[PDB]
Design an enzyme around this catalytic site. Structure first.
Site, PDB file in Angstrom:
ATOM      1  N   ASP A  16     -10.636  -1.179   1.551  1.00  0.00           N
ATOM      2  CA  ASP A  16     -12.261  -1.272   1.316  1.00  0.00           C
ATOM      3  C   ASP A  16     -12.988   0.479   1.640  1.00  0.00           C
ATOM      4  O   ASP A  16     -14.357  -0.279   2.220  1.00  0.00           O
ATOM      5  CB  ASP A  16     -12.874  -2.187   2.627  1.00  0.00           C
ATOM      6  CG  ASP A  16     -11.744  -1.968   3.257  1.00  0.00           C
ATOM      7  OD1 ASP A  16     -11.517  -0.956   4.218  1.00  0.00           O
ATOM      8  OD2 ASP A  16     -12.109  -3.078   4.451  1.00  0.00           O
ATOM      9  N   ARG A  30     -17.934   2.300   3.169  1.00  0.00           N
ATOM     10  CA  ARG A  30     -16.669   1.296   3.700  1.00  0.00           C
ATOM     11  C   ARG A  30     -17.640  -0.007   2.474  1.00  0.00           C
ATOM     12  O   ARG A  30     -19.167   0.303   2.580  1.00  0.00           O
ATOM     13  CB  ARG A  30     -16.777   0.869   4.771  1.00  0.00           C
ATOM     14  CG  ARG A  30     -16.560  -0.167   5.227  1.00  0.00           C
ATOM     15  CD  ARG A  30     -15.367  -0.293   5.339  1.00  0.00           C
ATOM     16  NE  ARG A  30     -14.606  -1.146   6.627  1.00  0.00           N
ATOM     17  CZ  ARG A  30     -15.042  -2.546   6.296  1.00  0.00           C
ATOM     18  NH1 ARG A  30     -14.689  -3.244   4.607  1.00  0.00           N
ATOM     19  NH2 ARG A  30     -14.599  -4.012   6.700  1.00  0.00           N
ATOM     20  N   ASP A  36     -10.561  -5.574   3.674  1.00  0.00           N
ATOM     21  CA  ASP A  36      -9.258  -5.577   3.381  1.00  0.00           C
ATOM     22  C   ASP A  36      -8.653  -5.447   4.170  1.00  0.00           C
ATOM     23  O   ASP A  36      -8.935  -4.750   5.343  1.00  0.00           O
ATOM     24  CB  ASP A  36      -9.236  -4.117   2.126  1.00  0.00           C
ATOM     25  CG  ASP A  36      -8.319  -3.236   3.538  1.00  0.00           C
ATOM     26  OD1 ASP A  36      -8.790  -3.431   4.269  1.00  0.00           O
ATOM     27  OD2 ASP A  36      -7.898  -2.064   2.713  1.00  0.00           O
ATOM     28  N   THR A  37      -7.255  -5.506   4.153  1.00  0.00           N
ATOM     29  CA  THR A  37      -6.792  -5.643   5.171  1.00  0.00           C
ATOM     30  C   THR A  37      -5.943  -4.314   5.011  1.00  0.00           C
ATOM     31  O   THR A  37      -6.146  -4.013   3.934  1.00  0.00           O
ATOM     32  CB  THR A  37      -5.077  -7.854   5.031  1.00  0.00           C
ATOM     33  OG1 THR A  37      -4.029  -6.590   4.950  1.00  0.00           O
ATOM     34  CG2 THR A  37      -5.213  -7.781   3.498  1.00  0.00           C
ATOM     35  N   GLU A  39      -4.272  -0.461   4.446  1.00  0.00           N
ATOM     36  CA  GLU A  39      -3.330   0.368   5.125  1.00  0.00           C
ATOM     37  C   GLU A  39      -2.910   0.831   5.990  1.00  0.00           C
ATOM     38  O   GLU A  39      -1.822   1.153   6.244  1.00  0.00           O
ATOM     39  CB  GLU A  39      -3.336   1.431   3.770  1.00  0.00           C
ATOM     40  CG  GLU A  39      -1.928   0.800   3.142  1.00  0.00           C
ATOM     41  CD  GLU A  39      -1.479   2.475   2.209  1.00  0.00           C
ATOM     42  OE1 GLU A  39      -2.215   2.517   1.400  1.00  0.00           O
ATOM     43  OE2 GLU A  39       0.105   2.600   2.682  1.00  0.00           O
ATOM     44  N   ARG A  83     -20.087   6.233   8.274  1.00  0.00           N
ATOM     45  CA  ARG A  83     -19.462   5.557   6.625  1.00  0.00           C
ATOM     46  C   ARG A  83     -21.096   5.177   5.659  1.00  0.00           C
ATOM     47  O   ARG A  83     -21.345   4.313   6.764  1.00  0.00           O
ATOM     48  CB  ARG A  83     -18.601   4.743   6.703  1.00  0.00           C
ATOM     49  CG  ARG A  83     -17.651   5.089   7.185  1.00  0.00           C
ATOM     50  CD  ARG A  83     -16.270   4.305   7.591  1.00  0.00           C
ATOM     51  NE  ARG A  83     -17.176   3.474   8.280  1.00  0.00           N
ATOM     52  CZ  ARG A  83     -15.430   2.335   8.958  1.00  0.00           C
ATOM     53  NH1 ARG A  83     -14.733   2.650   8.803  1.00  0.00           N
ATOM     54  NH2 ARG A  83     -16.337   1.028   8.417  1.00  0.00           N
TER      55      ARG A  83
HETATM   56  C1  THP Z   1     -18.562  -2.953   7.247  1.00  0.00           C
HETATM   57  C2  THP Z   1     -19.186  -2.885   8.277  1.00  0.00           C
HETATM   58  C3  THP Z   1     -17.695  -2.198   9.209  1.00  0.00           C
HETATM   59  N1  THP Z   1     -18.281  -1.590  10.204  1.00  0.00           N
HETATM   60  C4  THP Z   1     -17.342  -2.151  11.719  1.00  0.00           C
HETATM   61  C5  THP Z   1     -16.829  -2.840  12.558  1.00  0.00           C
HETATM   62  C6  THP Z   1     -15.701  -2.647  13.084  1.00  0.00           C
HETATM   63  O1  THP Z   1     -16.812  -1.508  14.365  1.00  0.00           O
HETATM   64  P1  THP Z   1     -14.936  -1.578  15.558  1.00  0.00           P
HETATM   65  O2  THP Z   1     -14.211  -0.733  14.623  1.00  0.00           O
HETATM   66  O3  THP Z   1     -15.554  -1.426  16.393  1.00  0.00           O
HETATM   67  O4  THP Z   1     -14.232  -2.968  15.984  1.00  0.00           O
HETATM   68  C7  THP Z   1     -15.232  -1.148  12.724  1.00  0.00           C
HETATM   69  C8  THP Z   1     -14.258  -2.073  11.205  1.00  0.00           C
HETATM   70  O5  THP Z   1     -14.181  -1.552   9.493  1.00  0.00           O
HETATM   71  P2  THP Z   1     -12.611  -1.071   9.609  1.00  0.00           P
HETATM   72  O6  THP Z   1     -12.731  -2.451   8.534  1.00  0.00           O
HETATM   73  O7  THP Z   1     -13.219   0.118   8.272  1.00  0.00           O
HETATM   74  O8  THP Z   1     -12.027  -0.723  10.256  1.00  0.00           O
HETATM   75  O9  THP Z   1     -16.613  -1.154  11.332  1.00  0.00           O
HETATM   76  C9  THP Z   1     -19.979  -2.177  10.880  1.00  0.00           C
HETATM   77  O10 THP Z   1     -20.855  -1.814  11.788  1.00  0.00           O
HETATM   78  N2  THP Z   1     -20.626  -2.931   9.531  1.00  0.00           N
HETATM   79  C10 THP Z   1     -20.604  -3.112   8.695  1.00  0.00           C
HETATM   80  O11 THP Z   1     -20.942  -3.095   7.229  1.00  0.00           O
HETATM   81 CA    CA Z   2      -9.833  -1.679   5.649  1.00  0.00          CA
END
Ligand code: THP
Ligand code: CA
Length: 137
Positions: A16, A30, A36-37, A39, A83
Protein backbone atom coordinates in the site's frame (compact mmCIF):
# COMPACT_ATOMS: atom_id res chain seq x y z
CA UNK A 1 -16.79 14.83 -7.54
CA UNK A 2 -13.33 13.06 -7.55
CA UNK A 3 -11.13 12.72 -10.69
CA UNK A 4 -8.12 10.91 -12.03
CA UNK A 5 -4.82 12.53 -12.59
CA UNK A 6 -1.63 11.25 -14.35
CA UNK A 7 1.21 9.94 -12.26
CA UNK A 8 4.56 8.21 -13.25
CA UNK A 9 5.72 5.19 -11.17
CA UNK A 10 9.14 5.85 -9.50
CA UNK A 11 9.02 2.77 -7.29
CA UNK A 12 6.67 0.40 -5.43
CA UNK A 13 7.68 0.14 -1.74
CA UNK A 14 5.12 -2.30 -0.35
CA UNK A 15 1.45 -3.35 -0.85
CA UNK A 16 0.00 0.00 0.00
CA UNK A 17 2.85 2.51 -0.22
CA UNK A 18 4.19 3.57 -3.60
CA UNK A 19 6.47 6.41 -4.68
CA UNK A 20 5.15 8.36 -7.63
CA UNK A 21 6.21 11.32 -9.78
CA UNK A 22 3.07 13.47 -9.36
CA UNK A 23 2.85 16.86 -11.13
CA UNK A 24 6.64 16.86 -11.68
CA UNK A 25 7.57 16.02 -8.12
CA UNK A 26 8.66 12.73 -6.46
CA UNK A 27 6.48 11.68 -3.48
CA UNK A 28 5.37 8.72 -1.44
CA UNK A 29 1.67 7.94 -1.82
CA UNK A 30 -0.16 5.70 0.60
CA UNK A 31 -3.24 3.93 -0.56
CA UNK A 32 -6.35 5.09 1.09
CA UNK A 33 -8.40 2.80 3.24
CA UNK A 34 -6.02 -0.12 3.42
CA UNK A 35 -3.70 -1.84 5.60
CA UNK A 36 -1.68 -4.18 3.43
CA UNK A 37 0.04 -6.30 5.84
CA UNK A 38 3.76 -4.74 5.54
CA UNK A 39 6.87 -5.88 3.92
CA UNK A 40 8.71 -3.71 6.43
CA UNK A 41 6.36 -2.90 9.23
CA UNK A 42 7.79 -1.33 12.37
CA UNK A 43 6.27 -3.37 15.34
CA UNK A 44 6.85 -6.26 13.03
CA UNK A 45 10.36 -4.99 12.04
CA UNK A 46 9.33 -5.95 8.57
CA UNK A 47 7.72 -8.73 6.75
CA UNK A 48 4.19 -9.73 7.64
CA UNK A 49 2.20 -13.04 6.93
CA UNK A 50 0.90 -11.89 3.50
CA UNK A 51 2.75 -8.54 3.55
CA UNK A 52 5.37 -9.79 0.92
CA UNK A 53 2.64 -11.24 -1.41
CA UNK A 54 0.62 -7.94 -1.10
CA UNK A 55 3.91 -6.19 -1.98
CA UNK A 56 4.55 -8.46 -5.04
CA UNK A 57 1.02 -8.03 -6.28
CA UNK A 58 1.08 -4.21 -6.15
CA UNK A 59 4.69 -4.27 -7.57
CA UNK A 60 3.61 -6.22 -10.65
CA UNK A 61 0.31 -4.35 -11.07
CA UNK A 62 2.06 -0.94 -11.23
CA UNK A 63 5.24 -2.15 -12.95
CA UNK A 64 3.32 -3.62 -15.87
CA UNK A 65 0.66 -0.92 -16.16
CA UNK A 66 0.34 0.98 -19.38
CA UNK A 67 -0.51 4.07 -17.28
CA UNK A 68 -1.03 5.05 -13.68
CA UNK A 69 -3.60 7.61 -12.45
CA UNK A 70 -4.18 8.96 -8.88
CA UNK A 71 -7.52 9.92 -7.49
CA UNK A 72 -7.53 12.07 -4.30
CA UNK A 73 -10.58 11.94 -2.08
CA UNK A 74 -12.48 15.12 -0.97
CA UNK A 75 -10.65 15.66 2.40
CA UNK A 76 -6.97 16.16 3.01
CA UNK A 77 -4.49 15.12 0.34
CA UNK A 78 -1.65 14.33 2.69
CA UNK A 79 -1.27 12.55 5.93
CA UNK A 80 0.94 13.50 8.96
CA UNK A 81 3.97 11.81 7.33
CA UNK A 82 3.59 13.88 4.23
CA UNK A 83 2.48 10.95 2.06
CA UNK A 84 -0.12 11.69 -0.63
CA UNK A 85 -3.44 9.87 0.21
CA UNK A 86 -5.10 8.54 -2.92
CA UNK A 87 -6.94 5.75 -4.75
CA UNK A 88 -4.29 4.63 -7.34
CA UNK A 89 -5.48 3.07 -10.64
CA UNK A 90 -3.31 0.95 -12.98
CA UNK A 91 -4.90 0.71 -16.47
CA UNK A 92 -8.10 1.88 -15.01
CA UNK A 93 -8.24 -0.76 -12.27
CA UNK A 94 -8.11 0.46 -8.72
CA UNK A 95 -5.06 -1.08 -7.03
CA UNK A 96 -6.77 -0.46 -3.58
CA UNK A 97 -9.71 -2.67 -4.41
CA UNK A 98 -7.75 -5.38 -6.30
CA UNK A 99 -5.61 -5.90 -3.19
CA UNK A 100 -8.71 -6.13 -1.00
CA UNK A 101 -10.54 -8.43 -3.46
CA UNK A 102 -7.60 -10.79 -3.52
CA UNK A 103 -7.69 -10.99 0.32
CA UNK A 104 -4.17 -9.44 0.37
CA UNK A 105 -5.02 -6.25 2.42
CA UNK A 106 -7.75 -5.31 4.89
CA UNK A 107 -9.93 -2.14 4.88
CA UNK A 108 -8.67 0.13 7.69
CA UNK A 109 -7.92 3.87 8.56
CA UNK A 110 -11.29 5.11 7.48
CA UNK A 111 -11.39 8.84 8.25
CA UNK A 112 -14.25 10.77 6.79
CA UNK A 113 -14.40 12.82 4.53
CA UNK A 114 -11.73 10.51 2.98
CA UNK A 115 -14.05 7.50 2.44
CA UNK A 116 -15.92 7.90 -0.81
CA UNK A 117 -15.03 4.33 -1.93
CA UNK A 118 -15.38 2.82 1.54
CA UNK A 119 -18.49 0.79 0.80
CA UNK A 120 -17.02 -0.45 -2.50
CA UNK A 121 -13.95 -1.73 -0.67
CA UNK A 122 -16.01 -3.24 2.18
CA UNK A 123 -17.99 -5.28 -0.48
CA UNK A 124 -14.77 -6.58 -2.14
CA UNK A 125 -13.49 -7.41 1.27
CA UNK A 126 -16.73 -9.30 2.18
CA UNK A 127 -16.31 -11.38 -1.02
CA UNK A 128 -12.56 -12.21 -0.23
CA UNK A 129 -13.78 -13.42 3.19
CA UNK A 130 -16.57 -15.55 1.70
CA UNK A 131 -14.10 -17.15 -0.74
CA UNK A 132 -11.53 -17.57 2.06
CA UNK A 133 -8.67 -15.92 0.13
CA UNK A 134 -5.14 -15.54 1.56
CA UNK A 135 -5.39 -13.68 4.95
CA UNK A 136 -8.92 -14.96 5.31
CA UNK A 137 -8.11 -18.66 4.76
C1 THP B 1 -3.93 5.33 5.26
C2 THP B 1 -3.70 6.37 6.36
C3 THP B 1 -2.75 6.20 7.32
N1 THP B 1 -2.54 7.13 8.31
C4 THP B 1 -1.54 6.96 9.42
C5 THP B 1 -2.17 6.10 10.46
C6 THP B 1 -0.98 5.46 11.12
O1 THP B 1 -0.34 6.36 12.01
P1 THP B 1 0.67 5.79 13.13
O2 THP B 1 2.10 5.45 12.50
O3 THP B 1 0.81 6.92 14.09
O4 THP B 1 0.18 4.59 13.86
C7 THP B 1 -0.04 5.24 10.02
C8 THP B 1 -0.23 3.90 9.42
O5 THP B 1 0.45 3.88 8.14
P2 THP B 1 1.22 2.57 7.60
O6 THP B 1 0.27 1.44 7.59
O7 THP B 1 1.84 2.94 6.28
O8 THP B 1 2.45 2.17 8.53
O9 THP B 1 -0.36 6.26 9.07
C9 THP B 1 -3.32 8.26 8.34
O10 THP B 1 -3.19 9.16 9.17
N2 THP B 1 -4.27 8.40 7.37
C10 THP B 1 -4.55 7.52 6.35
O11 THP B 1 -5.45 7.78 5.54
CA1 CA C 1 2.31 -0.95 4.29
Amino acid sequence: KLHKEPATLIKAIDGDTVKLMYKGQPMTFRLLLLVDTPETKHPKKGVEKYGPEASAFTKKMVENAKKIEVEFDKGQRTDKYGRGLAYIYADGKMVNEALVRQGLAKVAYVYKPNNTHEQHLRKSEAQAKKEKLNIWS
